Each structure stands twice: as C-alpha cells, then as structure tokens.
C-alpha cells in the first residue's frame, strides 16, 4: 500500500441519529430505525455513480457517519478539493430529501480536510481498505466539533477554497488532540 501527498478526506455525520434510534417492540427492537438509516446510506451512495462525483471514494461508514475521500485516483492539482465540497452539499440535498418523506429534521455535519495519507488495506482475516495519516484524524475532529449544516475547513483548506470561488468564516480556535489548538473555518453558502 502506497501513500499520497494530497488526498481530500470528508466526514459527514448525523448527530441527531443516535437519539432517533429506539429499541421498542414496536420498531422490531430498532430494526425499523436501521432501515431508515439504510435508506439514507444508500441514498448517499447513489451519488458516487454520478459523473461529477466520479472521483469520490466511499471509504466506509462509522455508525451514522459517512467517510469519503477525493484524490486517491492520482499518483488544478487541488480541484478535487472543491469536488469534495460539491459532494458535501450533495449529501445534504439528499439528507433533507429524506426528511421530506420521513417527517424528520436530520441535519448533516461535515469535516473536510486535505493532505498526505496512507491508503492501503489492513487485517489478515478479511483485508479491508482504509486510508490513514494525521490528515484523517483532523478531518474527523473537524466534524465531531463541527456545526450542523456547516462544513468545517482548516486554514489552508480555507485558502484553497477561496482561490476556488468560496467565501469562508472563522469558527475560532479548536483543540485537535495531538496537534494542539488549531484555527478553523466554516464554509459559507
């Protein structure tokens, strides 16, 4: 397994789900809930097969959190970075689409970042594909502390986005365990 120098990792989570999940005899012990989530996760994958997102890779799904990444199909140079944001919106358009038919108000929370990672597989049993790198740790932390319906980008990510036609706002400082305190930004719409 190789390592890239510029991969754009994204995390889109639904905080409002852990509560939605109920284990009552009525909902078959939380089956009906997972059924809804299954719809959601599926509705999200029906994006990966679209031409404009032909460069996005669904890495996995942790709980109700979607993990994608753009720029793994390589050996602007930072345009795949803007596509990850184009995708973030995508998920939203679809997450609120579901809300129409479920009488819900699920809000998505995103954490985008970009930098060196280490793609590859892991695990002897049934080898599974995953990318490592500090770049990933910050992306996740850029979500767990994000704000609903807001994408959280770092400084340079902020910069690159502006040089791509994006307006940003400073969230303020945030503590990223391991990297200390970091200044973050919210993408404007």
């Amino acid at each position: 397994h190789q390592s890239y120098d510029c991969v754009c990792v994204m995390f889109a989570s639904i905080p409002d789900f852990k509560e939605f999940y109920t284990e009552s005899d009525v909902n078959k012990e939380g089956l009906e809930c997972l059924r809804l989530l299954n719809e959601i996760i599926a509705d999200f994958d029906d994006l990966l097969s679209k031409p404009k997102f032909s460069g996005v890779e669904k890495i996995k799904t942790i709980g109700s959190t979607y993990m994608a990444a753009t720029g793994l199909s390589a050996i602007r140079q930072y345009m795949h970075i803007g596509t990850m944001v184009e995708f973030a919106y995508a998920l939203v358009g679809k997450l609120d689409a579901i809300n129409k038919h479920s009488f819900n108000d699920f809000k998505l929370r995103v954490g985008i970042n970009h930098g060196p990672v280490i793609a590859g597989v892991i695990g002897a049993q049934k080898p599974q594909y995953d990318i490592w790198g500090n770049t990933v740790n910050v992306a996740s932390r850029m979500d767990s502390t994000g704000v609903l319906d807001k994408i959280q980008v770092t400084e340079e990510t902020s910069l690159i986005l502006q040089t791509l036609g994006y307006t940003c706002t400073c969230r303020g400082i945030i503590n990223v365990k391991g990297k200390g305190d970091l200044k973050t930004y919210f993408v404007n719409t």
Partner: protein, 330 residues
Amino acid sequence: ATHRLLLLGAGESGKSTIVKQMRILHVGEKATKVQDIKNNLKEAIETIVAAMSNLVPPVELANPENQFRVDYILSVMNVPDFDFPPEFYEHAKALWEDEGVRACYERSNEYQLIDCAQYFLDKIDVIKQDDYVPSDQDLLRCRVLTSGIFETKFQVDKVNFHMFDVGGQRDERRKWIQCFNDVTAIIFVVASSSYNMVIREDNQTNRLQEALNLFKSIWNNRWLRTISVILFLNKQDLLAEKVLAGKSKIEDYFPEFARYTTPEDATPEPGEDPRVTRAKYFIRDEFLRISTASGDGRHYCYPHFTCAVDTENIRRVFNDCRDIIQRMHL
C-alpha cells in the same frame, strides 16, 4: 391472515378514538380514566374563561357576580394536583350557565379548545359524584394526547388485525416511518369539522389545510406508492352543525367552495340538508384531487364519512374496510 393498519392524521384528528371503538366493538378499568375526564372538564372551562378577555372584541359575562368564580377557575388553573373540591363543580357549572361564558364558547375556534368541551361540561352534575362511573360514551369522548406508538391487536371472525396509533402532532410524525415498512393499509383520519380552526403547533396553519398537506405527503410518499389509503373523513356531526349554524361560512376559509356545486354520485344520508351534503362532499373531493393527481393505479383511496364517537357508524365503516382489505386482496 393477520393485517397491520396504521392510522395517520393530524392532531386530535380522532385516531385514538377509533382504536377505542375497536376495543368497544371487537375486544372495570374505568376507575383510572375518571381522573382524565375531570381533567378535561377542568381544562375545558378554564380555557373558555381564559379566552374571555383575550378575544377581540373581549367577551363580558352576563353575571357580574360570576367574576369571583372566574378568579377561582384561574387561581387553580396551573395547580399541580387538583383535588376537585365540591366547590369546583359549582363555580364551574355556574360559569357554564353564564351566558357570556357560552357566548365565548361559540367562538372557541379563535383559540385552542378540546372537542369534548360542551359534552362533558353538560354533565358536571354527573362527573362530580363519588359513585360516578364513566359510560362507554364518556371514554370515546375523553381526550388524552398520544405520544409514541401503541399497538392494539384485536380479532374479527378468526382474522387478526393489528391497529397502530401514533401521535398526530408534528414532532410526533417522525416516529411514523417506523411503521411504514409492511403495512396492509393506511387509515387516514381527517377532522372534517375543524375547517375554521388552526393547529396547536403554531396557531396559524388551518387544521384542515394541515390535514391536506399531510395527506398529500402520505399519498405521494416514496414508501407508500402502493399502499392504499382508507380516508376517514371524521367529525361529520360537528361539521353539519357548523354548516347549518352558518356562523362561519366555508367559502370564507376555502374560497374555492363558492364555485363548488354538489356531486352526481352523491348519496346523501337519510334526511340530510343539501347544504351539509354539499359541504361534506366538498371536503372529500378536496382530498380526492390529491389522490387523483398521482398514484398511477398502484394504490387507491377509499374515502368514508365517519364519526368516531358513534360506535354504530364505526362498526359499519370498519366493515366497508374489512371488505376492501379482502376484495382488494391486500
């Protein structure tokens, strides 16, 4: 062959009331629901007196004396555990007797007020007895909000039904989906009389219009594109009174009514004022336009002019349903 029926509709639409009939019809605990009846009685009176002054124009009592009873009903309004002292029923009745209090009642649409209002208030003398035992009608009339999903399982002619009651309120609609998968049919409930009222959720959205957009939301659902809806246009009685009373014209809440003329296939019940016939079918067609738009014959809509409090009308209609469930091989 077991079924799963999901009752859907806005708040106080009458879902809970229909599930009651199913127990009354196909299924000494009352000592517990007596409390709930006295709470209705209390909320009813205190709500009316409370709106007296807030309404525009304000409503004045016909009895200046009753002003002291008004102070009472209010001083106890927020009270946690009310003991319902023998006085309560007196001041309460005294107020129900007051002409101004009733004057304000005839405008109860201008504020949120339960339906069993007049019903229960007209029997304070009975509910106050320590030997008071609720009739079956007093249960069909009692009003308690539903929060969550509860499954009533009854049987008819060795056939099983699994009734599903959910919260009609908005914040409740999110739990509905948990019953969407694998459901025989949908019993959609509509407050056919609540056309001149607004919902409790925001005090602006017309109760009927809400029931419409809600129906449109269900009918045009991405998970109910084949599930058939048994539309229950309820509260026909409360409707007719309003229509005949004529105090609040329909073409003033739903202007499209002015251009409406009574149907052809109209089968008006024995001795029914054409004005009513016209009105009730209006409300029904309003719903039919929603179901006629899409669906593409993958699912159908079977309306009904029901009255959930009438165990007689419910026994009847529930059969016209049981037929559809068989006839359509659902």
